[PDB]
Homo-oligomer: A and B are copies of this chain.
Amino acid sequence: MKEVVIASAVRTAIGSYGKSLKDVPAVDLGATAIKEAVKKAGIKPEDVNEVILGNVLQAGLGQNPARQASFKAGLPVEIPAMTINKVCGSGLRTVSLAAQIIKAGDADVIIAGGMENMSRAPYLANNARWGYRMGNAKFVDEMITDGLWDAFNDYHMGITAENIAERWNISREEQDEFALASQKKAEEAIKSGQFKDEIVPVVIKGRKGETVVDTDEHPRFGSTIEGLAKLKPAFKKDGTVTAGNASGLNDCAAVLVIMSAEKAKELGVKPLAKIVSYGSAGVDPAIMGYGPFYATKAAIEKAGWTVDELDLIESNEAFAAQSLAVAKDLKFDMNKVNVNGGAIALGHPIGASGARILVTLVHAMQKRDAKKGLATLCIGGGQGTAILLEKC
């Protein structure tokens, strides 16, 4: 049916926990990235049919955080919006949902992506409404419960990363060397201007003064292998995962204008890339056949491609252990992966992260003249999200 393209792809800088964006609600980050994505695509806000934004920690953000972002961006109040939560998947799954609505014939132009401000997550009192009656109870970290805690196994995401490291023998040393390379690559990318096209500044009107945040602050410049080897395991006595080889808690928004090829032509848009296939795409049989990261595998097959044919790959770094497991199984050429650094250095703003790596992927393909790109994040049946792009 319709071909689907990315007309623009914009993100804020990624802030560190409790730092540069602590005072900027997720919805304002979202609004900042939407306003700019719309200008960068060269379309009018009224050309937009629907807004679809991921956001995981919605607690106390008020009704329909995606709608607030749309309205704050200056989009027409009558554009419908919805907020999606698939945890790790949210921000990228909104892009494939956009492509699906366009394919169904119901839209031509959709704002997609995601936003998160983990620094601002609340604490919760779950039994304040009808009473605790008696006894100490839990004052709930909402960021941990709704974003980072495995609802079924009743342990932290970090434990899952340990399990994978264990089962595959991904050693502490191997994870730290991977973390070091992500740090070095982010530092070079930032210092060489590789993110200048994709970052929209955020303006914080301070008590008096305006502050501009326009640079990713999470990378630890000058990281060394020695510095990483000294860190204590963060999740498990004598484990392999540390602060050093895992991503952080971060704040960002990242937004893309998704359009039918035919509408892009009509509006004089010069698109950046075509969406070729995605993890959600087509149906079955059979699911289990490909192995444990079958989402990404099957998405690659549906595009008619192989891993060797890919020019650039964004494979999210929630934990180095998980990144190394995926790269090993799919036999990625590591020179083509996370070329501007990955989440260990840059940050993992949950609900925005899938969209963030797609924004970094599309600009890197443009910059480096790379024809075939893969963005992939999250691990395990039901959860993997992946998109394949072919540059225009």
Contact = CB atoms under 8 A, between A and B. Distances in A.
A18 B100 contact: no
Given A128-B128, A129-B119, A280-B50, A144 B140 contact: no
B87 A84 contact: no
A99 B106 CA distance: 11
Nearest to A126: B122
A61 to B, nearest CB: 7
A79 B138 contact: no
B63 A151 contact: yes
B128 A123 contact: yes
A100 to B, nearest CB: 4
A131 interface: yes
A74 interface: no
A376 to B, nearest CB: 14
A150 interface: yes
7 contacts: A59-B122, A64-B85, A68-B152, A82-B85, A100-B106, A105-B283, A134-B249
Given A63-B150, A82-B84, A124-B124, 19 more contacts: A50-B280, A59-B59, A60-B142, A63-B146, A67-B382, A68-B152, A77-B382, A79-B382, A82-B90, A119-B129, A121-B129, A122-B128, A122-B129, A124-B142, A129-B133, A129-B141, A134-B141, A135-B141, A138-B138
